[PDB]
Amino acid sequence: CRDMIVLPEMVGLTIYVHNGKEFVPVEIKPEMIGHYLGEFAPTRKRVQHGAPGIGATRSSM
Amino acid sequence: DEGYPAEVIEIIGRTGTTGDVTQVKVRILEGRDKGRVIRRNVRGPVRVGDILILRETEREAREIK
């Protein structure tokens, strides 16, 4: 359930939220009240770019 | 200085690289050569009875077919 809203009675527990391929731990802190759980479980990996390949510019085609 | 008026009396045909020029025959109305008939190249639309202002009246265009 990524659309569950964090409530005060949930403070102090640790929940494992599905991100698409695995469950990640989230430690609920008081300043999280009012947010969806999914905000703490990213679903994409950060992008580190490589070298542009063939066809990346006009001259390489 | 102020040119010489001439009057169009005949249309001969189109010419130029892109067909933008017409050859005509004019009759001088003023000056030393009043009454003479010579042919000229004109740019722009023209019809019989128009009046041109020539800066000189001793140059004549080469005849076209």
Partner: protein, 214 residues
């Protein structure tokens, strides 16, 4: 602001915009005489019925021709005084009421500054700004050359009107002057053969280049 006698103005005679008569206006140039139309007419708006027929623009009142000429953007695909002038959404394209107002205010300014009939001053301007010799281009050896030719009266009139409008357009662009003031300034300067006018300078340059290639 504008007095109510001007907001609700009613004419009673056929005269240009109900304010100026064109009876005493005469044209000096013998070639342009049968192409400057001066028949009596109240409203200079003919709704574009002349574009269909050949030579049909000959019988269109000269004030309406000026109004049509200034109803534009100005510098779309060639540079005027060193700049493109692309106004787009803030231009005068298809807004003929505003152009009418601009021409009216310019005529009032002209009458105030010089004391003469504004149509007469306009005629003088177009007489002084109409070139008499032009040039055509030929290509040889990958190089372009000029050859001098003559100009028909209709093309003379068209070029003069376009150059006057372009000069006025350039003078008010991103400066504190207004469009009506620039138009008045341009017409007055052209009527006095002042080189500071865009149209007169253009005519001089065209004729000089044509002469240097006979």
């Amino acid at each position: 602001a504008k007095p109510l006698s001007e907001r609700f103005f009613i004419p009673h005679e056929i005269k240009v915009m109900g304010r100026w008569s064109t009876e005493d206006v005469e044209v000096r140039d013998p070639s342009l005489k049968p192409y400057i139309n001066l028949e009596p007419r109240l409203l200079p708006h003919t709704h574009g019925r002349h574009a269909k027929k050949h030579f049909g623009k000959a019988n269109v009142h000269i004030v309406e021709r000026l109004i049509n000429k200034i109803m534009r953007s100005g510098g779309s695909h060639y540079k005027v005084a060193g700049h493109f002038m692309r106004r787009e959404h803030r231009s005068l394209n298809s807004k003929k009421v505003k152009a009418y107002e601009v021409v009216k205010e310019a005529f009032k300014i002209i009458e105030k500054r010089t004391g003469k009939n504004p149509i007469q001053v306009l005629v003088w301007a177009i007489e002084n700004a109409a070139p008499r010799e032009d040039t055509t281009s030929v290509m040889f050896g990958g190089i372009r050359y000029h050859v001098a030719v003559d100009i028909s009266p209709m093309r003379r009139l068209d070029v003069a009107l376009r150059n006057i409008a372009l000069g006025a357009s350039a003078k008010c662009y991103r400066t504190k002057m207004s469009f009506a003031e620039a138009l008045a300034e341009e017409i007055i300067l052209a009527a006095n053969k002042d080189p500071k006018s865009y149209a007169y300078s253009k005519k001089l340059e065209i004729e000089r280049i044509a002469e240097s290639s006979r």
